Design a protein around this ligand. Structure first.
Ligand code: HEC
Ligand code: HEC
Ligand code: HEC
Ligand code: HEC
Ligand code: HEC
Ligand code: HEC
Ligand code: HEC
Ligand code: HEC
Ligand code: HEC
Ligand code: HEC
Ligand code: HEC
Ligand code: HEC
Ligand code: HEC
Ligand code: HEC
Ligand SMILES: [Ca+2]
Ligand SMILES: [Ca+2]
Ligand SMILES: [Cl-]
Ligand SMILES: [Cl-]
Ligand SMILES: [Co+2]
Ligand SMILES: [Co+2]
Ligand SMILES: [Co+2]
Ligand SMILES: [Co+2]
Ligand code: NA
Ligand code: NA
Lengths: 519, 517
């Protein structure tokens, strides 16, 4: 049973926390709810931490006073198909194995499921840790509350005696590295320097042994990722987001200068031994586009290569923790700005980008974004109660489960069936274009070995490799992006038609050169 | 059908021309509703010649208005059919005590769907002595058949005679020609204004009702609310025109400004130059007036004079009368025409008989004050994602259509909330009706005890006067079908008045009995 501490004693040293805490809606909430600092208080100085206090990072620490939000946060949507592979005629990318080749995603790329599972799913997917981590039982796949309480309560390490990345099962990969975890958990928020730079005060960095880092982490999407625990104010904590918006001055809405003045991030920096260590970004308004955009964006969180000379770019380089902060039509220029590509296609030899869930950068410029709508309006609205305080739901999911709040409050002349039909019209149209982009891209790729074997020149092959970069970018954006065009149907349509145009041009060039060489 | 030359008709029918050429039926030929070949061959402008036929079936309109016709014939199976009200499961458990020997004691069922109204009027146990009966108990479901014609589904047990008499032991012969005006207007060209005897009218208040019944077929004819020549909104019910115009009360007798905004313009049709029949053209399609042609308290029956007790028979216009007054003005209105309905068989008190006063109850209520009308809650437009949204044509409880009937205005309520608010009012009102019955029955049951104990005529007469008001302020609410929802504060005040009167009467009888003993 908790005993409150003398907050004034803490404030004597912790003046920034004092300024945040005394002024906001947690002014009456005592430190003991989230910190055990008895030995710390006995041993600290103005400058030395002394004994490190415990910080309780479980979402359950908030549940004593916010049970409603915590229960919603831990909830599971069983209708979100679990562990469903995308390289599959029943899913998003039937030809993915041809198109992605030997990239790590070829070992497994499933569709997303409920937020409660995010850290568990990161740990156990076949592409991440060589199959090292596994659910303790296949019964455990249902346990959202268990996952929230801690990954290691439901999964286990197949070899606690070693820390190396290796394969435990034949068809797995070891693609995980420490940067990944920033979009799964912030349990390490006090143990990771801004951007993951090596730092005297950081136990973990981009260059850490990822198996050891994994074992130190527990909880998914911590509540304090979107709310400052001291002031309650809305914020973001994700380093690479703050870097793009603030350090690089690109703004919260990089395509809209006025909106970027209306929605702002105010950086706060915390130090260790008088040296800058970590940052947060305080929001002036609770804009969920920025909160959700901590994770639902295209990023680098992985080694790659330089476009200029092909040299490896490893985890020591800041480019391996980067938000591109660009729409699909600006992405190629943004990747050139950092002189970077992800992988060389195993079949075609083309340098290629690897794209991931660019929801926010797709949403920019869309009709709903232009009308001031945000992610949470459609995916995470308030509950509706005849006789209750209407809190915000806290496990985002498709608007199909909540159409009256998500759509019909604005679109008041539609029935639920009509609004869903409008969704399906866009998704069906967009999916059809994705299928055709895959047909043409796979056709181009399958012709590369024919061309090489027929003696087609390097000049022709290099021309088509350059087309492959763009054919790939303007296809993969849309298999990566989870709305199947709904977030921006006109952009999806223009981009996918560009992918097809490029692949058709590449097929034509290869067929002509093969026929000439023959022969 | 082959169209007639309407220009030829107009040469002798300027009154119809003026209505037909300007409205939305200008292109609709006379042949849809009239057979006039022999009429044209034989008429002059001053001589009818052969009487042309006028088609009065709602199905005459269905050639071009099938959507409205289909809705009009529809049946709500959830509206409990042939359910007696003198019943612990229905509106008036002590009705047999309270009404005594009145004709309604033979049978008084709850209403059901409009399609059955004429059929139900013909076959109820209190109307024709059981003379008319469904041909089979299977026929009770047949709304469409009833619309097409009562005599396709019911039959006369003795076509060879025309007298009112009992065919079954517990029946009554309460029907008379005035009843039919709220069931059908098939007789619209055969009935003079108010049912006065008239050379041009084959039927009148004084007609042999059994013969009149056999000439009638269809329920609530479409043209009761719509002029068939111009399409404009109208009423045709004589007693309503008489209340609004002849009695000078106006369309909304409790709101002078609203009576100026909603106007009834009477139009009279002549026969051989003598006034014969009337309609009332409305300036707006006001369903309060359209529905109030029938859903009102009325006389449509013989009675007695308050002054001297003399019978008032069907020859007297008072037997076709709309009081057009709220419950608190009703006693005054009935005194104005010197009329009461019956003498209670037990107490000997002159009493009024009240019937479904929905319009006069609705007046002054919150919804009426806000411009809502009957059809807004009971007969709204259909709801279609991709269609022309026509108006439904068989009125029913808003519980079947809550979004349209209530939640479009009350946008902060769920369906369950709105129904909850209905039920709160109906439950509360029903509880007061039960208490009013308890007390009125206790008072009535004490009359024989008082008489047998030798209580004086003076005391009995004081209590008979109280009976009039205790009865009025109870029966209004068993007669009115909303169980208070139409005007909850008025139901509350009125029922508490009934109870107060009955309690006073009980006290007076008990004191006199005790003294006499
Ligand atoms: C009880 C000891 C609490 C603990 C533990 C947590 N919170 Fe809290 N929170 C608490 C109170 C009394 C209030 C003010 C409520 C009011 O309006 O009177 C709050 C408020 C918040 C809010 C603010 C929402 C708003 O109205 O602006 C947020 C976003 C919030 N709390 C978040 C939060 C988090 C993430 C917690 C775990 C780290 C947490 N709270 C714990 C009381 C208590
Ligand atoms: C990083 C910590 C994240 C934040 C902040 C947000 N999301 Fe998220 N989301 C994230 C992951 C890693 C996943 C997949 C989890 C898994 O185990 O597979 C998701 C999933 C979703 C989904 C799909 C849910 C389903 O039913 O399948 C949706 C609809 C979604 N995310 C939306 C969303 C919103 C609206 C956010 C801001 C309120 C948000 N997410 C933040 C990672 C992270
Ligand atoms: C009793 C006769 C059972 C029947 C019927 C079903 N299950 Fe079962 N299951 C049972 C036991 C005793 C166990 C082991 C539990 C443990 O101590 O670990 C299980 C296990 C499972 C699992 C996990 C399998 C694994 O990890 O190897 C799953 C996914 C599972 N059970 C599901 C399941 C389903 C869907 C059933 C209906 C078809 C079913 N079980 C029936 C006992 C019994
Ligand atoms: C924020 C910019 C992220 C980074 C860094 C990583 N992931 Fe991620 N992940 C993110 C989101 C918003 C989602 C849900 C949307 C989606 O398209 O899946 C996910 C999902 C996953 C999943 C579940 C689905 C799947 O691909 O099987 C896994 C297993 C996963 N993420 C693993 C993973 C790895 C190994 C990472 C570093 C190489 C990594 N994630 C980083 C957001 C972000
Ligand atoms: C970003 C992806 C979030 C995470 C992680 C958590 N919350 Fe949240 N919260 C979020 C939004 C977009 C909102 C609505 C803000 C608005 O003004 O519209 C909220 C709101 C709250 C509140 C305020 C009361 C309410 O609206 O419900 C509280 C107390 C709150 N959130 C608590 C909370 C808890 C306990 C969390 C971990 C279980 C948590 N939030 C995570 C966005 C995000
Ligand atoms: C309403 C105008 C929306 C806005 C704002 C956001 N999203 Fe969305 N999203 C929307 C729809 C109609 C769909 C298709 C859902 C379906 O059931 O077909 C989606 C899809 C997603 C998904 C995948 C969810 C799933 O299929 O289960 C995700 C992960 C997602 N959207 C994320 C997301 C983000 C991060 C947003 C802010 C940048 C965002 N959405 C806004 C509708 C709307
Ligand atoms: C003058 C030569 C006429 C011609 C041409 C038409 N009609 Fe006539 N109609 C005429 C008279 C003198 C009367 C009687 C008026 C009176 O004082 O009673 C009528 C009556 C009718 C009626 C009403 C019959 C009833 O039941 O009372 C109808 C429905 C009618 N007429 C129709 C009609 C049609 C459709 C004609 C063109 C085909 C037509 N009439 C011509 C005189 C004359
Ligand atoms: C159905 C859509 C009709 C059309 C088309 C025509 N008439 Fe009509 N008429 C109709 C009805 C139901 C009645 C009964 C009276 C009522 O008001 O509902 C009538 C009546 C007449 C009369 C009698 C008027 C009177 O003096 O009482 C006449 C003279 C008459 N109708 C003539 C008439 C003509 C000439 C038409 C073609 C131009 C015509 N009607 C069309 C129904 C319908
Ligand atoms: C076709 C030969 C028709 C017959 C038979 C009946 N009606 Fe009619 N009606 C018809 C038309 C072409 C129109 C105009 C439609 C339009 O879109 O404008 C109408 C209109 C009406 C109206 C509505 C007038 C308005 O204000 O909108 C009513 C109330 C109406 N019609 C009633 C009606 C009745 C009661 C009929 C049988 C006596 C009848 N119509 C027959 C075409 C035809
Ligand atoms: C006389 C021609 C009437 C007109 C005009 C209106 N109504 Fe009526 N209604 C009438 C009768 C004789 C009956 C009982 C019929 C039977 O066979 O029992 C009714 C019944 C109703 C009901 C109850 C329907 C049910 O489902 O039980 C309602 C709700 C009703 N009536 C409403 C109503 C409305 C709103 C009207 C104007 C549009 C209207 N009625 C006119 C007689 C007559
Ligand atoms: C065949 C073996 C039947 C079974 C099973 C049911 N019914 Fe019947 N019913 C049947 C016939 C041949 C008739 C007479 C039809 C005629 O020519 O008139 C009936 C009659 C009725 C009636 C009317 C009764 C009467 O007027 O005396 C009703 C109300 C009725 N049937 C209803 C009914 C019900 C509800 C049934 C299931 C409980 C049922 N019948 C079964 C033939 C058969
Ligand atoms: C209009 C002023 C009417 C007069 C004249 C008659 N009735 Fe009626 N009736 C009218 C309405 C609005 C309703 C439905 C509402 C209700 O409270 O019932 C009815 C209903 C009936 C019924 C069915 C219910 C029942 O009492 O069993 C019957 C059998 C009936 N009416 C018969 C009837 C008789 C015999 C009449 C003359 C003595 C009579 N009605 C006149 C409206 C009007
Ligand atoms: C009074 C009780 C009515 C009876 C009898 C009939 N109708 Fe009607 N009708 C009535 C109302 C209150 C309305 C709505 C008028 C408004 O302005 O809101 C209507 C409307 C029509 C229309 C117009 C198109 C529509 O709204 O559906 C038509 C064509 C119509 N009515 C035809 C019609 C028919 C064919 C009838 C007998 C089957 C009928 N009406 C009777 C009120 C009344
Ligand atoms: C909405 C504000 C209404 C107005 C306008 C009218 N009525 Fe009504 N009525 C209303 C309710 C909520 C109820 C109770 C229905 C229930 O299911 O509990 C009623 C009831 C009736 C009835 C009895 C219907 C039945 O129980 O099946 C009748 C015959 C009726 N009302 C007639 C009527 C009249 C004639 C109106 C205009 C004068 C009128 N109602 C207006 C709600 C509303
Ligand atoms: Ca990427
Ligand atoms: Ca009466
Ligand atoms: Cl754990
Ligand atoms: Cl018939
Ligand atoms: Co699926
Ligand atoms: Co993905
Ligand atoms: Co019942
Ligand atoms: Co009744
Ligand atoms: Na479920
Ligand atoms: Na039914």
């Amino acid at each position: 049973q908790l005993k409150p501490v003398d907050a004034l004693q803490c404030y004597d040293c912790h003046t920034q926390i004092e300024d945040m805490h005394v002024v906001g809606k947690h002014a009456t909430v005592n430190c003991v709810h989230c910190h055990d600092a008895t030995e710390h208080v006995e041993t600290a100085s103005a400058r030395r931490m002394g004994e490190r206090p415990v910080t309780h990072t479980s979402p359950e620490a908030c549940a004593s006073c916010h049970t409603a939000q915590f229960n919603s946060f831990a909830s599971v949507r069983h209708e979100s198909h679990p562990r469903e592979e995308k390289a599959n005629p029943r899913s998003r990318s039937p030809k993915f194995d041809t198109l992605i080749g030997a990239h790590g995603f070829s070992l497994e790329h499933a569709e997303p499921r409920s937020h409660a599972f995010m850290l568990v799913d990161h740990f156990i997917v076949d592409r991440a840790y060589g199959g090292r981590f596994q659910y303790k039982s296949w019964q455990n796949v249902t346990d959202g509350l268990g996952a929230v309480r801690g990954a290691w309560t439901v999964i286990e390490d197949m070899d606690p005696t070693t820390s190396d990345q290796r394969r435990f099962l034949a068809q797995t990969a070891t693609a995980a590295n420490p940067v990944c975890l920033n979009c799964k958990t912030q349990d390490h928020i006090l143990d990771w320097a801004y951007m993951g730079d090596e730092h005297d005060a950081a136990k973990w960095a981009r260059t850490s042994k990822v198996v050891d880092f994994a074992r130190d982490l527990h909880h998914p999407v911590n509540c304090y990722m979107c709310h400052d625990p001291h002031s309650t104010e809305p914020r973001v904590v994700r380093d690479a987001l703050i870097h793009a918006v603030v350090d690089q001055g690109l703004g919260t809405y990089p395509y809209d200068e006025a909106k970027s003045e209306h929605v702002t991030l105010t950086p706060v920096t915390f130090q260790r031994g008088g040296e800058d260590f970590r940052k947060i970004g305080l929001l002036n308004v609770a804009d969920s586009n920025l909160m959700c955009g901590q994770c639902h964006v295209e990023y680098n969180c992985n080694p790659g290569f330089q476009q200029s000379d092909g040299a490896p770019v490893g985890m020591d380089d800041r480019r391996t923790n980067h938000f591109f902060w660009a729409n699909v039509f600006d992405y190629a220029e943004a990747a050139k700005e950092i002189d970077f590509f992800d992988f060389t296609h195993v079949t075609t030899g083309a340098p290629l980008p690897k794209l991931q869930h660019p929801e926010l950068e797709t949403f920019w410029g869309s009709t709903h974004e232009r009308n001031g709508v945000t992610c949470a309006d459609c995916h995470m609205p308030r509950v509706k109660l005849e006789n209750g305080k209407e809190y915000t739901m806290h496990s985002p999911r498709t608007p199909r489960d909540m159409m009256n709040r998500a759509c019909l409050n604005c679109h008041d002349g539609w029935t639920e069936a009509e609004a869903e039909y409008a969704i399906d019209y866009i998704k069906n149209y967009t999916h059809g274009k994705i299928m055709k982009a895959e047909f043409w891209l796979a056709r181009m790729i399958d012709l590369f070995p024919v061309a090489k074997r027929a003696g087609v020149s390097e000049d022709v092959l290099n021309e088509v490799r350059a087309l492959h970069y763009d054919a790939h970018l303007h296809w993969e954006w849309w298999t990566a992006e989870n709305s199947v065009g709904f977030h921006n149907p006109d952009q999806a349509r223009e981009s996918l038609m560009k992918s097809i145009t490029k692949s058709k041009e590449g097929v034509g060039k290869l067929d002509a050169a093969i026929d000439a060489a023959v022969a």
